[PDB]
């Protein structure tokens, strides 16, 4: 499936959803400016409501390391 | 109402509290040097306990745009 | 300190052991409560930069505090070397200058008071530390339902003394926040005095309320 | 203070660092309880106006107190310039005069004791502050049902010492209010002594009541 | 105090500011507990009558105490003028004499120790005040059911030290009342020692009882 | 200490009775809490090895502490005699040398500062004692659920100051353990600051949390 | 104390008023807790027998203690007159000798240190008093079920310091009773260390137990 | 009754308490200098808690006419 | 209606009653000395019993700003 | 019985307690200087709480005749 | 009636009984030494048991001012 | 998981806790000088209360082999 | 058993406790100087509370014969 | 009867038994060495169990004054 | 029986089991290196589970004196 379709399941650990997201992003083959937008925006918007709340609290500049570090307890 | 006693409601969106706060800070007769301190300190101090927990993590330099961005849907 | 010898020339007289111990008591036991600045400013009367560095050797060990203090001293020494192109910043901070240079500077005509100047830079760093170690914001200070207004005023001014606020903001806090955070019975009296009230009027009105 | 040099001439000897720290302890820790006036009056023994101004630099920071103090000093300096048309008010307050003028005045024959005079104006301002910071009116002081009469007498006189009352009003308060506000068991003894009783008689009668 | 100058002649050296403050602490904070007399007697070492009057200026303000003190001093000054027809009573009390007369008297051969004599009259007045401010009669001092005998002995002797009793009556109180008012468990041990027991024997027997 | 005589030669001036009493208060009443090292280092200003041995005569009586101290001094005296083949170890420790040798060494050009060196060996032994008497490991220090972060930081740094850890381990403890052992509400704020936070940032963020 | 005059001759300098007051605080407020002996030994640095008698004038008033002290001094003065057939016992106790004799003796070559000797007899009497006023036997000192081993060790050694035991008995008490009276959880650790353990090992093992 | 123990009744009009107070201050044998202090301090101190709350707001300079005017119908 | 008829309703905020009073006073066209008396006297006497109590506690010299500031909580 | 433990009974006439007290003070082996102190201080200290309240009002100079006269029928 | 007959009624304020006593004493016209005895002795003996107790606690030297001052609370 | 929060289970064999601890100490990014302190102090501090009671008796010099040998079957 | 923990039984005759105590003091490996202190201090300290109350009255000089004689049948 | 027969009755005050004992001893007319033994030994052995316990706690050297002083409370 | 057969009974004091063990070891007559192994190893392995736990806590170097001292409470 395309990257737009990848969502976090209601009880899925964030690291597994991130792995699915980036595996799909690698197959999606969009140009790097679009990949920047997708990894900033879709990855947050398609998270669980709790995890999405944690991620939005980081603001827009968050790196993937920070996003995963924040979500370990979810 | 006095700016000192504007407090974010237990379920009030932070943008609504910001609107109440700054609409009242225009009424306050204190000097601009005092209003600067009010914007810096009262806005965080009088936030909702959840939202206040978000805001204090942003540090003392945080802009109002950053504060509002962090507290979306809190 | 500086003392005139029997030859009439000015000479160093060391900051005494039990004065240093009184400063150690202030640093160790009062936990950078704001009276640390009056007590530093008192115990360092007449102190040369060598004496002041001797007093800072007990702030060392409070590694966070001593970091804030050293960086503030270095900042002011740089500001000195910027403003003034005679002692350089490290000489007035007494790290490079000799004791005899410091005493000379302090006793020339006019005096070059490297002691009192460096003591101001230290007091500015102690202010930063006293702010850091403040237990509360001035906004957190409220009068208890049975607390005497005198004791609340003491807590309020002690906290206001531990705050970054400019004198204009401190004036507004004194006029407005002190009333706002009083307990409702006492606050009723303070409101009835109106906005012009001095602290003397506020306290004599609320006495035993 | 003033000290005779080896040349026999009078010279300044600065108020020592640990004396100033003892005054800082009094200002900061005793919250203008009335013993601040005895302790000021003791620590300022022999103080020139320069020494007294050095001691007031720690009342600064208690912005309300220091305001009452400065305005009372300025009031007395104006009263001096009014009564006496030699030191002017700002010279005896040591803001304009030189240290050598102050020591000269204090050591001429007869002495012009600018130190002890200015120290009276400061003690008068400290009295105003001690009244402001009083936690209670003398009327609020009552003996508890199990409180020793000695402890109630101590609280009563401490408050009476913190009050504006003239000596005639203080005499009446001592004779009448002290009895009125005793607890009923103890008050019965005090009433039975009649109106002429001294405090010695009142205390020895109520001892352990 | 008196100090030998570089010329070898005896001269006045004033009772220091922080010694006076230590006496103010004793007067204000220890509420005429009996250690006020040891502490007065210590702080007044070498005091001339001018120094002693300087120390009494802080008992002033305790209007009852200072009345007892002044009247006892006047009584002893009258007794002096009665017994001795050189210093008169007001000269040895230092109200009329000059400082140079007081130092002369204290340093003639033999000395006329107006300081130590007047200091005895002051200690006699302080004794009267310490009795007045005693919280209890010696008869009220009892050992609590769980109180260590050491602490009861301390309370007992502190009160006995605050009492008018002659040394014969104090001896009887020590021998008899101290046993009588012990708690019954401890009292049983003290009774078993019989009447001859010293305090050392009583305390070592009751240790941890 | 060392004082220049009127002949200009350096001579011994004994560590004063009330300075020694201030050290006795530190040894007896503060139970080798870490401020004993600042207070020792202050009270021993200018101390010769004879003065330092006079100060150690009150650590004697704390038989465990004095054993650790003597063995550490002997260890450093042996290390001195090893490194340097002029004072021997027992001379710089002042057990064999004369007072005049110690003052000579301390006042030659360059100085041979047997006082400040031996004072470092004593401070090293006092460090060992302060570690022994530490009530807790740094790992045991946790913030209470209602404890102010300022008070927890004070307890944490006081314990960290009482620990054997090298500066690298102390840095890691400051960065990591201080956050780990905060209470969960406060810990949430500290986690949100990320790993780079200074203590100033941590405390201002958690202020009143 | 003894001070070299400007003429180079040794002369008396009186034990200062505020040193005597510090001894009065020790006698009155610390109730012959064992730190009274370190504090006496510190405050009496350089004391002549006249100075020591001046210090004993505040143990007078503690009639039991002063009796034990006088009789111990008289016992040692008799032992002196027995051993040595120059100062007699009453001269070294300073009751019969002149001040100039005492200073002569203390400053001849070799010195006849009547001060330090009489100070040992006083410390021996203070030891007897400290034993009498001990609140507990060393056998009564037990660790509470939640008491830190550090605090129990402090209580234990403080009591052991207040006991008649020879050093051999104190060594056995340290090795054996300290373990025996620990609480069972802590005692289990101390037993597991075996009999050879030093106090350092015992405390570091039981730290936070 | 002693002036020290004249207290305003829980429902007593302030004018009635003033009449009781000043009628008794004429009986008091104390000097005029003491009576001045009594008029200044006891009258407020012994007022009814509601009325006392009104009176303390008037400050130390307040005349008896002002005090009575403020407390009408309290 | 004439100014004498304007009264505060039992639950009316004081600011609304003041507005009605001064609107009527402007239409009443009495001379300024009478307006001074009316604004001092009728405005208090025609208030609610609670609000009238608060206003009488201010004494006779109170300005309209002070009167309205006092009554905000009623 | 020891003089220190002679106490007036809860209903005992003061004259009966005085008789018990002085009859026992003749037995006490203490010196006359101690007996003087006992007559002055114990007699009041050990009186019945009502009678003791009467006696302490008489002051320290009171004679036994005065003390007995005051306590008739107490 | 004669002075000997005047007694305090069981609930009579002492001042009223004193007034009756001295009005009768003025009519009795006995010589002054007898009046001294009567005013010292009958006036106490004919009081109520409570008031008589209070009066006896004053001892024999009490003036009429002291007697009345003592009995105000009875 | 952070090495600071690895704690021996209430019934966990000490060898299993040692395996968890040292496997995590390899993950910790702290310097070797800090890891030395961790091996010395955390391993004892975080042991099970029974096992911790055994380990503290071994003294500060104890090797891991000695610690494991002492805690067999604890 | 350790001499420190030999204690007289709640009903044990003092002679039986003395036999237990001294039979154990022969086992103790401590020096004679320590055993002297034990005979002087532990024997009293560890006595039964009744018997201990007897023994402490005898003073510090008491011989074992005197101690046993005093405690017969206690 | 002879001295050997004199015993303390189960509720008899010790002073009465002592009086009976010495009255009998005076009539018994035994030589003084025997009287010494009797007054030391029979006088204790023939006391009540409680009083005999108190007396034995005094040891063998007790004088009659001490014995009677000890037994006053029995 | 041979040394291998000697075991501690479920309630047997360790000293009795040690006595049985060494009595058997003396009869077993194995060479000293084997005796060293047996006294280190069998003596522990054949103890009760509790006593065996205490003994293993001592580690391998324990002397017989230490082993018996450790087990006195079992």
Author numbering:
A (entry chain C), B (entry chain B), H (entry chain B), I (entry chain C), J (entry chain B), K (entry chain C), ...: 148 to 221
C (entry chain A), D (entry chain A), E (entry chain A), F (entry chain A), G (entry chain A): 1 to 85, 98 to 221
Sentences reproduced from the published study:
pmcThe mature HIV-1 capsid is a conical, fullerene shell that encompasses the viral genome. It is constructed of a lattice of approximately 200 capsid protein (CA) hexamers incorporating CA pentamers at 12 highly curved vertices. The surface of the conical capsid is dense in protein-binding sites that mediate interactions with host machinery necessary for transport of the capsid through the cytoplasm into the nucleus. Here, we present structures at 2.6 to 3.5 Å resolution of CA hexamers and pentamers within in vitro assembled conical CA-IP6 polyhedra from multiple lattice contexts differing in local curvature and geometry, alone or in the presence of Nup153-, CPSF6-, or Sec24C-derived peptides.
